[PDB]
Design a protein around this ligand. Structure first.
Ligand SMILES: CC(=O)[C@@H](O)C(=O)COP(=O)(O)O
Ligand SMILES: CC(=O)[C@@H](O)C(=O)COP(=O)(O)O
Ligand SMILES: CC(=O)[C@@H](O)C(=O)COP(=O)(O)O
Ligand SMILES: CC(=O)[C@@H](O)C(=O)COP(=O)(O)O
Ligand SMILES: CC(=O)[C@@H](O)C(=O)COP(=O)(O)O
Lengths: 281, 281, 281, 281, 281
């Protein structure tokens, strides 16, 4: 009778502010919190998935020795289930984003992708999301959009987020009007995280037209403090993070490279004080 | 070129303020919005499912004649699929909460209920929610809780809210500590709407202790002037609406009783000016 | 001794008058009534699914912003699940018609569409109908019908209506004899809603030849006084509503435009007395 | 061109007037229409399923010999799948209603019934409806209603009507208050046809309180001049037909009895005028 | 090339050290890493599912106010789906252990539990594990074990860990020989996490005899200095962590108390360098 139900204190719902994800089930919003830091709304994603069509890329020839010491320093790991089960220790304890597409290679057509793992297996490995390429304007574009749909159709049954990454190929003009077309279609079809390329004009425009968080692709490795201005620019006009690739594992200062990348995204750091985490390491 | 992405304007998630329902999928939140008014957060639910174990209850002998003109002034209709399909015209265009429990009758033990319709048919009939009686303290309580468990498990797959109605047994009172026990376990098991009966002391402690909306059922017929004080009291110390059966259709002016409960719930009306326009019609 | 079954007054079924929808289950008839007002039998549909193959179309760069305040003034909203969950709040409380086709784009063949979301997810989102493009006379005409067939097969299990939208090419003469070919087949295939374009000669024959309701596609952006004339005569020749977009959200006065569209549709307003209080607020 | 769409003539829906069945899918409305003649809205059903718990009951020892010549003068046959496949020839071309309950007998508890055939097989047998006993007030009242629930849930997936037969005990009074309770519970649960017994006072009130068609069970053999008054009284009080087992096949002039029953049910003839067409044969 | 395959340096599998979990799939091993900290192999679990059969016990009347600020201090949360979706924010970003048993209450038999959630929904809710009570020696012991058997069966398909919690009666004077029975059977049946009570004589034989990790349940409220002696004694004698419900939300220093529990489990902190992790507030 002296117990306190606090009748004086009205119940009020606590808002979920991750962009365009305010009308999702708890679990899907839960997995998204593992990727996107709840304080920050952004992520630093470590991609080491390129072997799914490229093979032993420079720096991913040995995942266990040169990429293993880098896991602890990533917000979220991105790889394949083959790489995950083989060389990525479960005890590493980081959110994982699975490559669920493949059946392409650098010797044949690049857009000829199919779903590379079932949602059944994405769940069994306790994934936070699945990722697939969308290839608008390429030969097998129809199929590429269909891969997303199947993952999204499957993803809703289980609360598993889908990442659509807009994949450019051969000779294709990277501009804002294309990626605006490309990112939006993926988001329009239902993808909840978008991975894209930074564009020097109108990146502000691809993010705005995209209702859901947007992440940056690294591109080819530049000298180790390079376009952290790219990251800084990306974060400054709305990118929700970076899914950096070779730009990290091929850096010759891999643990010290991302301590730099953290700062630009979460620490709202100037691009040129990213070098203040220096390569004198 | 002439496009306006309003880059000056960051995208913002709009909070869903309905109590304990801020982390549900769009469709489930959508279904809750037909029932729970999105700007007042409350409901006036018309229950006439009483015949599912009582037969032709008084006021309910002819649903097509005496209840048909009331569909139109109700927020939500509550009946069985048998009544819904037979005499409730689809063109009524009101949210329906289906009675999904039964296999008991006033001739036997009354807590002896089982699921009376599959989620398949609730979806087929475009239900906004499914409802079942839970009988805490009764001979057959275990099964009644099991019914909700099944309905919630089935309901989550499809975005269908589940309503639990606290059916009291064998005069075991019917005080606050009992309804706190009944409502919370039900809410704990996963039901997003809870129907309970009003008590004259401490109804505020039942509402506060329940993580999801609580609406009260009308009970046996009272003088309409004694019955809107119940509504006024329930809503004022936190009820998120009403599920009023017999205090509507047993009255001499159900349509005028209608508006009066409506006046109390949504319009924050004091008790007797709601009947000061009960007799105005 | 106190019951009144009013045996003198026989039960009489109340007819469902919606054209060609008199032999449907309650739930399917229920869903059609959120869309078609049961008193007028008509609809005003706000289409903002344009981005599903076009990207950030002019007027849809910010759905979150410029088209969102217009939701309240539409009878039914039409969009994608990607857009719906991201930027359309559940509290909007409007019937939704989901874009259920896609995998095409402005860079490739435009008739090459596949089903873009499962019936599983349409239910989960509490859709009122699903829509797909049919491309009669086009390269992927066959597949476009197959998608329709597939949607009807899934919809019938669950009581969900399918809307067929006529897909035009850069090749095709738009006349009465053609839309009669396009609309009839879709209706013949099982579609309960057909979306087509107005023709200035013989539109009365397109309406007559279709056993189910016909709604108008918006067509190219017009001066608003041209689009209410488009609206008035089609409804004058039997149309059951509009599936309008750019004549509303590209208008520089979107809210004032739909009230003008409601009046022409519903209130049998002549187009130039509809313009009366087009300039209200 | 010379086509006649006769656009001056709007399409108008033709109502399905069968009581409480105006909101059913076409196929379900189709099956109910084979049973209930749409011109009279009534039926004469020849029930010979008695062997499912009674064994070779009197008059039914030889279905192939003393019941076979009666099929043609019946509107719909009611039997079990065992009798149907074995001794009822397919070429009979009459509607059949399958007994879908059993597993009881005259040597044990008579309410102890379970579902006796899957919906898979009712369809396989081109059934127009499935039937089960409901045993209100009995030991297995719970089970008997659950049997109905399972059949109605299954029937809705397939457009198969379910008939509920008020299985009554007994030490228990056959008054209107009982059949009103039994019939209402069954109809409320979803059964589209209810078979019950005629009572000399307030049967019209059993009819009025049931939203869906009511057909009467024949009961034990009466003098045929007495059974035509039961028929006359029942139809006069709102009943939609007959479910006549023993008052037909136990008569020594069964064919002439069904014509006598036909006259009362469809052609609205008096009992004493239907009686001299009971003779004449 | 620019390749470095380190042929001199063979790949080596990283051993997974969690007790009895060296033969599990990555995903299952992954989920256990969110619960048992990879540094220590230990956990501090915050249980507040008590209401699933007790209703609003003291400290749990309002989860959102007095339990919400504690999310910050446990390794893993243990609760129900009803509490989770309603009052636990996804942005909490915490490992969750769902209550997967219920259908009991304090007014009836307490061992009368059933499986309370589909594995489907635990996955949808991104659980790290599901938990159920085992009631060895009680009247409904059989079902409680089957509940465990079923959850593991569902879990093994999906890589979802099952926790078995030992449910005691006041039949039993509870000692070491008995909890040895309860813990072992469950682990034997397949549960990978075990919850037990401390016994002051022979707790060493329960942990050694249990092949999979054991966490101790707090039990009823005791003074914090000896309750931290419970934590120290259990952890020091091989227990792998705590599943601490009532002994935290008992304190007038709940928030400052778990740091005392925190330190003892993770750092092998002395019980009474721990009584005063009060300080200044
Ligand atoms: C198939 C791909 O697109 C990968 O190459 C990838 O996305 C990794 O990131 P980056 O290193 O390309 O930026
Ligand atoms: C147990 C019941 O009676 C339910 O049918 C119910 O909750 C309807 O409410 P009311 O009729 O008591 O107002
Ligand atoms: C496939 C489409 O393009 C439809 O979205 C459509 O045509 C209706 O909107 P409007 O663009 O005609 O106004
Ligand atoms: C199994 C039955 O009892 C029903 O098939 C039935 O009611 C037959 O009619 P009657 O034998 O009562 O005339
Ligand atoms: C039977 C219970 O009460 C469980 O819920 C439990 O043991 C949780 O921890 P504590 O209450 O022992 O601290």
């Amino acid at each position: 009778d002296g117990k306190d139900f606090r009748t004086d204190q009205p119940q009020k719902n606590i808002p979920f502010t991750l962009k365009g994800c305010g009308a999702l089930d708890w679990g899907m919003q839960s997995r998204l919190s593992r990727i996107f830091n709840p304080k920050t709304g952004k992520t630093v994603m470590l991609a080491f998935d390129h072997g799914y069509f490229q093979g032993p890329t420079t720096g991913l020839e040995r995942i266990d020795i040169n990429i293993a010491p880098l896991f602890e320093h990533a917000d979220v790991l991105m790889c394949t289930r083959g790489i995950l089960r083989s060389v990525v220790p479960p005890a590493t304890n980081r959110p994982v984003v699975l490559r669920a597409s493949g059946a392409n290679s650098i010797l044949a057509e690049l857009s000829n992708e199919a779903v590379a793992l079932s949602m059944d297996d994405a769940v069994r490995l306790n994934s936070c999301a699945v990722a697939a390429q969308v290839y608008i304007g390429s030969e097998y574009e129809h199929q590429s959009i269909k891969n997303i749909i199947q993952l999204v159709d499957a993803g809703m049954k289980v609360g598993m987020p889908t990442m659509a990454v807009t994949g450019v190929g051969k000779d294709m003009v990277r501009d804002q009007r294309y990626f605006s077309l490309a990112t939006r279609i993926a988001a329009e079809m239902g993808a909840q995280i978008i991975a894209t390329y930074y564009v020097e004009k109108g990146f502000e425009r691809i993010v705005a037209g995209c209702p859901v968080p947007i992440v940056i692709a690294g591109g080819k490795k530049l000298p180790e403090r390079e376009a952290l201005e790219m990251c800084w620019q990306a974060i400054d006009q709305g990118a929700s993070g970076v899914d950096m690739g070779r730009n990290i594992f091929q850096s010759d200062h891999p643990v010290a490279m991302m301590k730099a990348v953290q700062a630009v995204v979460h620490h709202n750091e100037t691009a040129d004080r990213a070098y203040e985490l220096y390569l004198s390491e």
